[PDB]
């Protein structure tokens, strides 16, 4: 029986829902058995990637002097980073626009 | 009466409040971040499943998820996600 309980996220030191991650792993037909540390490790990785993207987007929003991160700032944050762009090379971001880029031969002089 | 839908909105928001206390977010950027989280979840999950199949294992372990991360994440993203996950797993084991 249950009692005054906790979260597995709190035990792992994570903000992401390790329990939900374990549920999705077990109901996703990824394998018959799902080890207990797998959703913890995966939630840690998911939180790390989300934190990196959100921090870069917040820096980009600050440089724009905006308070709230928007798809434009997410696009800027992702495209302006070599390996994050590599990871999201195939991905399209709605309302993200494109990086400002004009080829040198198109400029005057 | 009406049905419920799960998302990662609250956890993305808490991570946002941790990394940038004053910086907010928008509905559309939260949708994009939900999609990003789901996409990478699916990517590592699928790759770990294939690792288990290739190695004839019934179980997805933290070692399988680690190898999937090392395969899918380029460069220093791999190193830092491995460090984050290893720290989380060691903490969970100790607690």
């Amino acid at each position, epitope marked *: 029986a249950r009692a005054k309980a906790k979260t597995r996220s709190s035990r792992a030191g994570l903000q992401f829902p390790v329990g939900r991650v374990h549920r999705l792993l077990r109901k996703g037909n990824y394998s018959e058995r799902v080890g207990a540390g797998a959703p913890v490790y995966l939630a840690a990785v998911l939180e790390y990637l989300t934190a*990196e993207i959100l*921090e*870069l987007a917040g820096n980009a929003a600050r440089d724009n002097k905006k308070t709230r991160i928007i798809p434009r700032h997410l696009q800027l944050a992702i495209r*302006n*980073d*070599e*390996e994050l762009n590599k990871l999201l090379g195939r991905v399209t971001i709605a309302q993200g626009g494109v*990086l400002p880029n004009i080829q040198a031969v198109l400029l005057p002089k | 009466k009406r049905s419920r839908k799960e998302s990662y909105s609250i956890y993305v928001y808490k991570v946002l409040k941790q*990394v940038h206390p004053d910086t907010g977010i928008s509905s559309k950027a939260m949708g994009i971040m939900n999609s990003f989280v789901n996409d990478i979840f699916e990517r590592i999950a699928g790759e770990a499943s294939r690792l288990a199949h290739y190695n004839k294992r019934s179980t997805i372990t933290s070692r399988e998820i680690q190898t999937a991360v090392r395969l899918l994440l380029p*460069g*220093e*993203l791999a190193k*830092h996600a491995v*460090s984050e996950g290893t720290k989380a797993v060691t903490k969970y084991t100790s607690a």
Partner: single-chain antibody
Amino acid sequence: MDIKMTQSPSSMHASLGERVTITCKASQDIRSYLSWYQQKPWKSPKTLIYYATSLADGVPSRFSGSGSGQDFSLTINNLESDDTATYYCLQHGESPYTFGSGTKLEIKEVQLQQSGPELVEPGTSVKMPCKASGYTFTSYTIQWVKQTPRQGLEWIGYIYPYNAGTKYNEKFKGKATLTSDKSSSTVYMELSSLTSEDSAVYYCARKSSRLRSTLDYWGQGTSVTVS
């Protein structure tokens, strides 16, 4: 408004096999983006701790870092003769990076090829190359650091070769200029209007675009002397 780095124990003396502890105070919250560097005399600084806790590659467990927010600490457990060096902290949580004042200790393959010493006259301009090898050039920023024997280490700026983005220290706008050549895997920093104040040893330093990644590999240093 620059983040002041405050190493409390400016100098310590210790014997072999005992413990030494160094502390660091910030002026604002930096959220654990702090690194520790060991610089032997006339040698390039080698990183020891990054993200305020993580051991760097090839660093033994004898070094331990701690702290977050504004109070940080470095610990060395089993001192050896080789440990005699000066240790700097470095915060990179805010755009102008700041090194610590330096703590002296006395005990009783990624390659960044850098140019040799250059003697130059005031008012001229100077361009120093960094030749990078052993790693994917475009994925990492190159960080340029100025070490005076009086003001300690100072951060000039970085260039990000993937899109040629740059950021400069407010003290160094105009003075320094950064350019990159992908084909030769070489980055140039140009100094304009040389002054006797500019007489310092400059280090190129590789740093990943990952926020928690620190200046990890350092060039041998190019001394610039202004008459």
